[PDB]
Hints:
The structure is cut from a larger assembly and holds chains A and B. Chain A is 0% helix and 0% strand. Chain A contains no helices and no strands. The N and C termini of chain A lie far apart (124 Å). The chains hardly touch. Chain B: It is found in: Nucleus; Nucleus, Nucleolus; Cytoplasm, Cytosol.
Amino acid sequence: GGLTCASAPQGTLRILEGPQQSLSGSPLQPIPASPPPQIPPGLRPRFCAFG
Amino acid sequence: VDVVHMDENSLEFDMVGIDAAIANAFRRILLAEVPTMAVEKVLVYNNTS
Lengths: 51, 49
């Protein structure tokens, strides 16, 4: 009436919960790159010679 | 000598026909040898600024 060893298991199942990968879009930056410093339009000379 | 502009606080004469030594003498006189009056001593009775 006691507990005895039974037949060895024939296989093992290991369960884990996993989600999946999306598409590669690689959206690097809101406003991207190093935007260049640049000329103010027209500007004009702010200096003249004497005479 | 030809005086072009002469507002108050400005002059632009020409000074045609003189050497660089005399012109430079005139320029250095105006900057450093023409006399002016300016505060030299200050007596401060109170100053809570």
